[PDB]
Amino acid sequence: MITHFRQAIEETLPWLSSFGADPAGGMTRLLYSPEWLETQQQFKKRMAASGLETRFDEVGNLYGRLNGTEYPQEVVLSGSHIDTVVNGGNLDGQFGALAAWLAIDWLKTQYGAPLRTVEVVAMAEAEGSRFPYVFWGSKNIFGLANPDDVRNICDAKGNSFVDAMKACGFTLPNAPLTPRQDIKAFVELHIEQGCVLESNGQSIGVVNAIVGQRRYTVTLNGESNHAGTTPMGYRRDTVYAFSRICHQSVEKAKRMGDPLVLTFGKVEPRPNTVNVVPGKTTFTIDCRHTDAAVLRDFTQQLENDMRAICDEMDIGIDIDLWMDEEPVPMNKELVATLTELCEREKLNYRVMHSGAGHDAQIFAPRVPTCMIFIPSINGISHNPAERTNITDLAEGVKTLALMLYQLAWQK
Template identity: 80%
Template structure:
């Protein structure tokens, strides 16, 4: 079976990766771009040639359906997003969509029609790389998208979201699309985008939760002054205050331990010149954890500690918590079923959490959802160097196919 999926991947992944191929390497396939549209159209044609029923929804999500014989109105859905970051790799997102197609094609050829309908989805967008909006594809499927949120936004070239949408033949809905009620389960295959599986030399990750995230923009205000004539004791140095905040916070995060992670990803000191004490510094904080209470408690302690440090350094502080996303657990029954499957097939697996966000987190509050991870070489993603060994790619498609078989071909 592994050889069958390996050959299928070798025949299709290079083909799919030609659409939106970046001249400098990797893929640039942004929402409602010509490259995005060509990908969806070509993908649709290939799946139609396989005898699947294909369609676009109102916003450009692509579906390919294998109708069920006994419960046609009960859908087992699998797939991922088809868009990419700028100059990204050829696995993030699109391999999950490709894997769903290959798995359904194999099931059709091997077992014929399922009891429940099987659908593959290549979701229009997840990354937010072109427009300042994320999960546009999955949010529309689950009734969470608000057209007003995108009506007046534009990309970096000033092209409006609605304009780009129209150019691809789609029209912004007047109101939010209703959530689909026919989906009985959603299974997403994705590369890990980390090094846990590779480090432990394991091929499959059974995801039990997607981390919650809290993101901050923090502004420190002190006083810009002459670097030579301002004594150390007189200074209101915001970079020094930031350095204390960063160092002490990271130490606290390390003491807290896994699965908590903390990142200071952006720092902008002003005036940012060699001979002036920096009177203003803006920085960001990204903190993630699988437990909502632990995330809240840790970040609230950080806020208190930051204010104390700034008081000691005679620096003012403004803390803007602009993202507060709760962790999203996967469906316990599906996680148990997938774990049992991995055991019965003697797969080298581990149960783990996802430190990155995925479309599965939009589905999970509405329908039973689970995720399958496969390793990322070196943990590299969002990069043309993004790679996964072919044996692991094939193992992932096989695991997905066996899971879809249980959900669609067996009485529940």
């Protein structure tokens, strides 16, 4: 069975990874890009060929469905996001969608139709890496996505959300969607992304909680001027202002210690020229913690700090909080069932939280959910070198299969 999944992964992973392969390294498959569309089209086609009933929903989440014999109205769901960051790896997101499909297909062949319906899902986006919105895919599954929040947003190159979506053959809905009521449980297999499993020698992570997370886009407005003729004390330099903000804030975060993390990942000065004092800089903030209050208090302090610096420098600031998620626990009963499985199968597991966000955190408050981690070598992710031992991946798909067996082929 490990042998089967190994083979299946070796067969399909390289194939799936070709759609959105970036010449500059790794994967770049952003929400509603042509690469995004082609991935979902091809993936759909392969699931169909395997005998699954396939569909898009109104926003382009992809489903492969195998109907239940005794409770067709109850759905056990598994999968993950297909989107990536820029120059990402080929496991983050897509592996969990691929795995759910491989698990289901194998269960189908070994044990025939399930008692209750099982679905593979490949969700539209969870990376929040193209537009200033996150979890467009999963939020729509539960009608949590307000179309007003994306009707007026663009990517870095000025393409509107609405246009890109339409280019992929989807129409922005007029109002939030009807939330699904038929889901009994959701199970997301995913690479750990950090090195907790690898450094402690363990093979499977049983996730019991996911971190809280804020993302900001901040815009500094100063004055563009000549690099040579503008005396230093007359300047309104947005890159200098940005640097004080970044330097001071990272310093503060380092004093708070783990698990506070703080990242200034994207910086865009304008006009971005060697001999021009930059009169505008737009940058992002990503900040996370296991505790909601710590995350709130720390980030609010950061907002005050930024306003203080800017005010002192006579520079305009616009602070745009576009992701604000509470930490969420996984379902206790499902976490026990998973732990019990690991004990029974004699798996070398650990119980741990996720430092990454996942569609699972959107699911959790609405339907019973849990996550299975497998290791990430060197704790490298969002980097083309992201990789995992093939037997570890297979062990993950096996563990996923057994969980889905319990949940859908048993009453």
